[PDB]
Symmetry: C8
Subunit: 63 residues, 8 copies
């Protein structure tokens, strides 16, 4: 079972124009300001790459 009470993922792009790290947490999209928080959540949710051009489509599907 998911003891952490969190479902979702971190996402970022390694392309030319970064949007920082963001996350979907329990169906809510948030921005992450600090790398400490990124590494903290990487202990409990996956962290994947999403290009800047694709974030809008993924946002729609995660609604």
């Amino acid at each position: 079972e998911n003891v952490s009470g969190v479902q979702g993922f971190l996402f970022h792009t390694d392309g030319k124009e970064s949007y920082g790290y963001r996350a979907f947490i329990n169906g809510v999209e948030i921005g992450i300001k600090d790398i400490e928080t990124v590494q903290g959540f990487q202990q409990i949710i996956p962290s994947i790459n999403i290009s800047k051009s694709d974030v809008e489509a993924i946002k729609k599907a995660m609604k």
Copy 2:
């Protein structure tokens, strides 16, 4: 049969046949086109990636509705 922590159910699909349609995906029941290979590799970390002929996409869309 392991816990899904990502809150994402679905799969990537493409064809290796004639008439590529690029990469697409079903993400929580929503069909999307994928524009960049980076995003394909990212979602391949959390959902399966399978082959679907161009001729079969419409039928699969009707089941994934």
Copy 3:
């Protein structure tokens, strides 16, 4: 958990009169036209044999 979002199976017969490959996907019966698609779905759902004479009964139970 079923990360793929698909529940069901492919079915076909090896008997004298083929009906091609079909599948039940999330309770919806579809025909599959291309072997590429069959092999794609064999990565994520089972593929079993069902004789032509038995498909009608299985259809009823999968309603």
Copy 4:
């Protein structure tokens, strides 16, 4: 205790006693007769196959309703 991907719950049943009734199955709560051994072998890939005496089938049907 592993994930069931097939969307099928049930079992095949037959008797090895006197008075065979062939192979039958419960598929998602629906009782069916099976006409061909090919179908028996196919469903044996995804659901259990057990023995039930002819005299016990009616009782099992009432529980599998």
Copy 5:
């Protein structure tokens, strides 16, 4: 997952007055007439001992 679609158990007593084999199948109590059927269901559900004097209490809890 429970692919068989059956939840329950077989029960019998080895005491002086047998009541045969019975079973709870999906919350329904039935008698089992033939040992072939007992061994068939032992492939998919547990088989435990319950004394004749205790069957009434277990019936109440399985209602």
Copy 6:
């Protein structure tokens, strides 16, 4: 963390202290007394069997309601 096929959730309980109350059980939220050791051994195949002091039974009943 394995599949429960028995359709029974609960546990047997007894005390090894002063003032035995015999063996009892919670079976799907119903508290019962057990009359025969055979039944204790049978249910020990499918549900846990733990020790509860006589003085604590009332509190546990209120949680298992």
Copy 7:
């Protein structure tokens, strides 16, 4: 699956003023009087430390 029908945990403090052992059992807070019962439930639920000053906050979250 949780065959025992119990979800929760035992809690106590090793600090200067003990409150005994308590437990949350299926969302119900109870006191435990006897160590036999503590060891019995330690067979089936976790047993953690909670300081006396923190029990009120944990009670609120377990409501």
Copy 8:
């Protein structure tokens, strides 16, 4: 991916950066401050403990609502 018997979902969080806020937790969707290290070590037996910058706590609260 193992059974959670504790009836608790959530996590402990603290920062190692400038401006500590101590240890806090989400417990079944309720945010709490933790006053004693004993309680931190106790909950570390049953829920994860992760790092969250002070600047990110407000955003995480909005998702954990």
